[PDB]
Design an enzyme around this catalytic site. Structure first.
Site, PDB file in Angstrom:
ATOM      1  N   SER A 185      43.576  45.652  39.842  1.00 57.55           N
ATOM      2  CA  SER A 185      44.244  46.715  39.101  1.00 57.55           C
ATOM      3  C   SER A 185      44.905  46.217  37.822  1.00 57.55           C
ATOM      4  O   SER A 185      45.321  45.059  37.731  1.00 57.55           O
ATOM      5  CB  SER A 185      45.286  47.406  39.980  1.00 57.55           C
ATOM      6  N   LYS A 186      44.998  47.113  36.842  1.00 59.45           N
ATOM      7  CA  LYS A 186      45.689  46.853  35.579  1.00 59.45           C
ATOM      8  C   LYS A 186      47.214  46.792  35.781  1.00 59.45           C
ATOM      9  O   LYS A 186      47.924  46.115  35.031  1.00 59.45           O
ATOM     10  CB  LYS A 186      45.306  47.923  34.545  1.00 59.45           C
ATOM     11  N   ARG A 187      47.702  47.490  36.805  1.00 58.36           N
ATOM     12  CA  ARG A 187      49.127  47.477  37.151  1.00 58.36           C
ATOM     13  C   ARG A 187      49.514  46.222  37.936  1.00 58.36           C
ATOM     14  O   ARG A 187      50.686  45.827  37.943  1.00 58.36           O
ATOM     15  CB  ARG A 187      49.529  48.763  37.896  1.00 58.36           C
ATOM     16  N   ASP A 188      48.525  45.610  38.593  1.00 59.15           N
ATOM     17  CA  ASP A 188      48.675  44.300  39.237  1.00 59.15           C
ATOM     18  C   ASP A 188      48.823  43.215  38.161  1.00 59.15           C
ATOM     19  O   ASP A 188      47.920  43.043  37.335  1.00 59.15           O
ATOM     20  CB  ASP A 188      47.463  44.005  40.137  1.00 59.15           C
ATOM     21  N   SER A 206      46.011  40.549  36.667  1.00 57.27           N
ATOM     22  CA  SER A 206      44.881  40.951  35.819  1.00 57.27           C
ATOM     23  C   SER A 206      45.201  40.746  34.345  1.00 57.27           C
ATOM     24  O   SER A 206      44.304  40.715  33.504  1.00 57.27           O
ATOM     25  CB  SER A 206      44.513  42.421  36.056  1.00 57.27           C
TER      26      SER A 206
END
Length: 481
Positions: A255-258, A261
């Site tokens: 994820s981009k929110r993770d 990344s």
């Protein structure tokens, strides 16, 4: 030969490691084959953060050591390299597709297609139904007099839609299963479905290497690429290469929110470009069966995208850090010292040692850190203004038996002639192990705390040296009580 590949993001948000791998895999393949690496900005759909993101993308590429041959700043024989500056080109190419009868103006509302499907017994869920192919010039003009804004659709061929993916092997779509696709919006502006293959075609791209989340698009683009040759805009079809999607922590996409990344999080922590490039390379590729540790030069010699596996790669931070540490360990000490010093400084974490004293400290840290940022915590005791005796360490070490220890240590140290680690060691061993007869780990423990404030520290005796006689003594005397 000659290989031309392309890195062609939209400018939105920080560059993510999945997108940077794609960048890397193209750069290596270009460099492997003697080819050209083209940097094309896909900014037809400009959002607010677009300059923020453009600037972020070039920084990622420039930090990691990945130059482009054609694109922004550098130019090229196939420009401009911003999609936003090629509006004329799309309109022309749309004009020719139309004239050739490769494409046609479509006027159908989705309600109209739906009703046709209904009338046919078919499920409406099916896409566009190709109806608008057979419109009379009367029907067309009529629509325009009504105010209907047509979109341009490509006439698909009627046979099996296939290609041999370099990573996935053969992929086939049933004949007649992919509907004639929109090239524009009602507004008249081109979509990705037009600009992407149009630009690949015109920039003479020979190999497309991209996330497999785009795979479905591919039979549309091959169909478009085929029309473009007919109309004389191209002469070759590119090969496609669909790269394995990078997985997060659950078997879903990273994820981009993770945080992991985000390329710049890794950089902020103290990933060096060598460590991150080695890592990203292992996201869908191995260089050999006997090792995974390599530099970029070794990557370029070895990299061919046909060895990329279609098996999904999982991100492993432990593996990432491990590779960064070995890369940190691999630098010559001059280079590393200047990198360590700059990381710290530009983070507001300047260590107050002179150029030679710092060099010594950096030589100790080179084999004790996984990232560049790790130093701040190990070294900040050298800063008077950062010195804090940690509550637990003073409670455990600086109690009752701490007294004889610090007393004996202070006694031993005051006659050290040259303040040097060997002689500090020689004095402290004689007073505390030989003299007081305790286990080294218990003799040197409270001394560690008196000098560093904590129970884990760089080699203690080297540390005492760099700290100077004066501050060591000062810190030890105050520590008693």
């Amino acid at each position: 030969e000659t290989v031309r590949v392309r890195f062609c993001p939209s400018p939105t948000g920080t560059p993510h490691v999945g997108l940077v791998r794609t960048a890397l895999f193209n750069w290596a393949y270009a460099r492997h084959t003697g080819g050209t690496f083209v940097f094309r900005i896909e900014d037809t759909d400009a959002q607010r953060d677009s300059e923020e993101s453009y600037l972020a993308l070039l920084d990622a590429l420039r930090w990691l050591g990945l130059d482009w041959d054609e694109g922004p700043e550098v130019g090229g024989p196939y420009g401009p390299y911003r999609q936003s500056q090629r509006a004329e080109i799309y309109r022309d190419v749309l004009a020719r597709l139309l004239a050739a009868g490769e494409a046609y103006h479509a006027f159908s509302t989705p309600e109209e297609v739906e009703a046709r499907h209904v009338a046919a017994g078919r499920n409406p869920k099916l896409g566009y139904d190709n109806f608008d192919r057979h419109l009379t010039d009367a029907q067309r003009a009529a629509y325009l007099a009504e105010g209907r804004q047509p979109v341009v659709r490509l006439r698909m061929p009627d046979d099996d839609l296939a290609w041999n993916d370099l990573v996935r092997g053969p992929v086939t779509f049933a004949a007649g299963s992919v509907p004639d696709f929109a090239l524009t919006r009602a507004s008249g502006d081109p979509l990705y479905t037009l600009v992407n293959p149009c630009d690949d075609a015109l920039m003479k791209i020979t190999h497309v290497l991209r996330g497999e989340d785009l795979l479905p698009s591919t039979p549309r683009q091959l169909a478009l690429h085929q029309a473009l040759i007919r109309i004389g805009v191209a002469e070759r079809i590119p090969k496609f290469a669909h790269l394995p999607t990078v997985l997060g922590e659950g078997t879903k996409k990273l994820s981009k929110r993770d945080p992991q990344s985000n390329l710049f999080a890794h950089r902020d922590r103290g990933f060096i470009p060598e460590g991150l490039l080695n890592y990203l390379a292992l996201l869908g590729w191995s260089i050999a069966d006997d090792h995974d540790l390599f530099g970029l030069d070794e990557m370029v010699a070895a990299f061919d995208v046909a060895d990329v596996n279609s098996s999904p790669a999982r991100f492993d931070q432990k593996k990432a850090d491990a590779l960064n540490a070995e890369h940190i360990r691999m630098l010559d000490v001059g280079d590393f010292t200047v990198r360590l010093r700059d990381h710290l400084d530009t983070h507001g974490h300047h260590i107050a040692l002179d150029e030679a004293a710092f060099a010594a400290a950096a030589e100790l840290m080179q084999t004790r850190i996984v990232v560049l940022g790790d130093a701040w915590e190990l070294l900040k005791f050298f800063n008077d203004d950062q010195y804090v005796i940690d509550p637990k360490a003073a409670a455990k070490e600086l109690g009752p038996d701490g007294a004889a220890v610090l007393d004996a240590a202070l006694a031993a140290l005051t006659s050290v002639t040259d303040w040097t680690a060997p002689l500090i060691e020689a004095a402290l061993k004689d007073a505390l192990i030989e003299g007081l007869a305790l286990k080294p780990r218990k003799a040197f423990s409270p001394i560690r705390v008196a000098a560093t404030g904590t129970t884990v520290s760089p080699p203690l005796f080297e540390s005492l040296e760099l700290l100077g006689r004066d501050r060591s003594m000062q810190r030890l005397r105050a520590a008693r009580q």
